Amino acid sequence: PVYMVYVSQDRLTPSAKHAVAKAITDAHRGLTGTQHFLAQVNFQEQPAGNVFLGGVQQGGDTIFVHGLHREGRSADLKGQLAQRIVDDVSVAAEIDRKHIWVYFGEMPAQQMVEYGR
Amino acid sequence: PVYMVYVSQDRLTPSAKHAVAKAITDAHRGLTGTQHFLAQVNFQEQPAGNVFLGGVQQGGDTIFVHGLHREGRSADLKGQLAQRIVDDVSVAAEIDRKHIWVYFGEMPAQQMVEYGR
Amino acid sequence: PVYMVYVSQDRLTPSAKHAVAKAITDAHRGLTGTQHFLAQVNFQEQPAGNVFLGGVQQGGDTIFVHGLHREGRSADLKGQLAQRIVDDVSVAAEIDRKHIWVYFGEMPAQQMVEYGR
């Protein structure tokens, strides 16, 4: 899978990015059985103030995780995985759970290429 | 929903970002009935020249809105909403309609987490 | 379509971006018949070190292409197109194929607006 992780610049130190990448990657491997190396975490940083919730400009605490997955997993498992990402990223980023949004999009496997293969 | 809004750096002033966030958020609330606070607008700025249309390098005027929505709305309503975003963002950003692209992607509700809930 | 192309800052020169935009755009036109001008390539650059594969922090060589397409093409054609993007971007960016990830997401045509139309 590819996890696009949208954060404000300087919210995560390099240490914190590695911890957040680990939490997401371990959750994905642990819950789906997909091998570690097939999980990409791609941090997308923007300046503080580029996030609006109900039209209101936020600080730097919002984390939006957009996971791009293969189709074919149950709703139950997807929910568990989304919940695990919230819990584990919140510990990893020392950030309140309320700041974390997680959406999964799904695609047929045949239109998903990792490692040019 | 989460609206990822891809713009060139310095095309939108902070004022203009707030106006564009308001236009998108109000359209979403007005047309779907989803509460204001459940709409995130996340501005993703890049340097001028990172956008190509038919292989041709553009200036800073392109706005691409990628709205990430729950599945289950009619094609008619989605079209209305996309059209409203074009009209209202174009007023809000003082930008010609021809510069505005809007795509909606949809997901089962059970794999969509807002506010860590 | 819209091709979001996630690369590290300074990995692609402006020349290389134009070459990568051309390779993607030509592949899309050649394989689907969709007119050139309907293909957007939108480069999203981040600082080196924002990409993790299996939890491991990468250099600046990863290219992730997220193509946002209309629904309705065959799995065979989508696979061919994904493969062509890998081959052609790898020549265009002078980058090993193993660095290139390509995922296609699909949407009903009626929720896809290009050029405000």
CATH number of the domain residue A65 falls in: 3.30.429.10
Resolution in A: 2.0
| Burial call C31-48: b when 16+ CB within 10 Å, e when fewer | bbebeeebbbbbbbbbee
Helices (H), A47-100: 75-92
A3: nearest Cα among C101, C38, C82, B20: C101
3-state SS of B60-113 is CCCEEEEEEEECCCCHHHHHHHHHHHHHHHHHHCCCCHHHEEEEEEEECHHHEE
**Maximum separation of any 2 CA atoms in chain C, in Å:** 43
Q: Are B65 and C36 in contact (CB under 8 A)?
A: no
Cα Rg of chain C (Å, integer):
14
Domain count, chain C: 1
Q: Are A8 and A47 in contact (CB under 8 A)?
A: yes
Distance from CA of C96 to the nearest CA of B (A): 22
Tokens of B75: 């094609």
Rounded to whole angstroms, the Cα distance separating A46 from A5 reads: 11
Residue holding tokens 């990015």?
A17
Tokens of A17: 């990015």
Sheet holding A63-70, edge to edge: B112-113, A100-107, A63-70, A2-8, A40-46, C51-53, C56-57
Helices B75-92, B14-32: crossing angle, 10 deg rounding: 160
Residue holding tokens 């409203």?
B84
**A to C CB pairs, distance under 8 Å:** 103
Give the nearest chain C residue to B90 (CA atoms). Answer: C116
With an 8 Å Cβ cutoff, are A104 and B107 in contact? yes
Q: Are A70 and A109 in contact (CB under 8 A)?
A: yes
Residue holding tokens 């041709």?
B56
With an 8 Å Cβ cutoff, are C99 and A116 in contact? yes
C113 secondary structure, DSSP code: E
Rounded to whole angstroms, the Cα distance separating A25 from A65 reads: 12
Which domain does B2 fall in, by range? 1-117
Rounded to whole angstroms, the Cα distance separating A9 from A31 reads: 30
Q: How far is CA C16 from the centre of its chain?
A: 13
Give the nearest chain B residue to A54 (CA atoms). Answer: B37
Distance from CA of A70 to the nearest CA of C (A): 10
With an 8 Å Cβ cutoff, are C102 and A113 in contact? yes
**∠ CA B88-B85-B32, rounded to 5°:** 115
C77: nearest Cα among C41, C28, C24: C28
Sequence-distant (6+) residues with CB within 8 A of A74 are none
Give the three-class secondary structure for A81.
helix
Q: Strand A2-8 vs strand C112-113: parallel, antiparallel, or unpaired?
A: unpaired
Chain breaks in chain A (C to N over 2.5 A) after: none
With an 8 Å Cβ cutoff, are C52 and A25 in contact? yes
Helices (H), chain A: 14-32, 75-92
Most C CBs within 10 A among B46, B65, B73, B101, hence the mutation to make, goes to: B101
Helix (H) or strand (E) holding A41: strand A40-46
Tokens of C26: 């030509």
| Burial call B71-97: b when 16+ CB within 10 Å, e when fewer | eebeeeebbebbbbbbebbbebbebee
Give the three-class secondary structure for A21.
helix
Give the three-class secondary structure for C102.
strand
Q: What are the beta bridge partners of residue C52?
A: A41, C57
Rounded to whole angstroms, the Cα distance separating B78 from B97 reads: 18
Where on the phi/psi map is residue C70: left (φ > 0), alpha (ψ -120 to 50), or beta? beta
Helix (H) or strand (E) holding C24: helix C14-32
Question: What amino acid occupies position C113?
Answer: V
Give the three-class secondary structure for B4.
strand
